[PDB]
Design a protein around this ligand. Structure first.
Ligand SMILES: O[C@@H]1[C@@H](O)[C@H](O)OC[C@H]1O
Length: 206
């Protein structure tokens, strides 16, 4: 149902998470399957997601081929991302496949390559977080990014294609912790309605 504070659980088969740091507010409404809506106001950082959490024992290859069909009405007022998001451990990595954004195309780095997939082209980037919040407390970890060259708010995201592309460029991943269609807000406000979000693993939906 309605979530306005940091929370992890399972709704309609999908692992959802609400996460924000202090400042401003956010509201997440959990709808059928992987669908949810999101509103935020005067946040520093906020994340809204529904996908799949893993027990950190398998590589993406061992999990299997991952793919998400999604559609969203994406209405940010400032900096925000509509993306597939998640983590690995050993190495600890925060990752992004961004299809849309607000006023700023992330991450502000030099591309390491590109991948052409799902009817578009993405620049690939690697950045570094030093002693920042993580799924494992304050930590130092890399971020991997695929960022579409033009905004899109519905389609298929061939998640594993990006994973393979990253690893080809020497951006290696560890054991899967999570994969999830995600709305992020950074020092901004806005709203979003994810009316479609289906995660398939080996062609089988959650
Ligand atoms: O990399 C940035 C991250 O550090 C911040 O917390 O949220 C916005 C991102 O672009």
């Amino acid at each position: 149902e309605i979530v306005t504070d940091n929370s992890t659980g399972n709704h309609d088969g999908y692992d959802y998470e609400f996460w924000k740091d202090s400042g401003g507010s956010g509201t997440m409404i959990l709808n059928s399957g992987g669908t949810f809506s999101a509103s935020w106001s005067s946040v520093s950082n906020i994340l809204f997601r529904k996908g799949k959490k893993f027990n950190e024992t398998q590589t993406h290859q061992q999990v299997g081929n991952m793919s998400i069909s999604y559609g969203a009405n994406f209405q940010p007022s400032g900096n925000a991302y509509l993306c597939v998001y998640g983590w690995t451990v050993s190495p600890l990595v925060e990752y992004y496949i961004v299809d849309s954004w607000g006023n700023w195309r992330p991450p502000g780095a030099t591309p390491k390559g590109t991948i052409t997939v799902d009817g578009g082209t993405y620049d690939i980037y690697e950045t570094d977080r030093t002693n920042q919040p993580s799924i494992k407390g304050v930590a130092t970890f890399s971020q991997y990014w695929s960022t579409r060259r033009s905004k899109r708010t519905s389609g298929t995201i061939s998640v594993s294609n990006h994973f393979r592309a990253w690893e080809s460029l020497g951006m290696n991943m560890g054991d899967m912790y999570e994969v999830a269609l995600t709305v992020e807000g950074y020092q901004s406000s806005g709203s979003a309605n994810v009316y479609s979000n289906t995660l398939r693993i080996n062609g089988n939906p959650l």
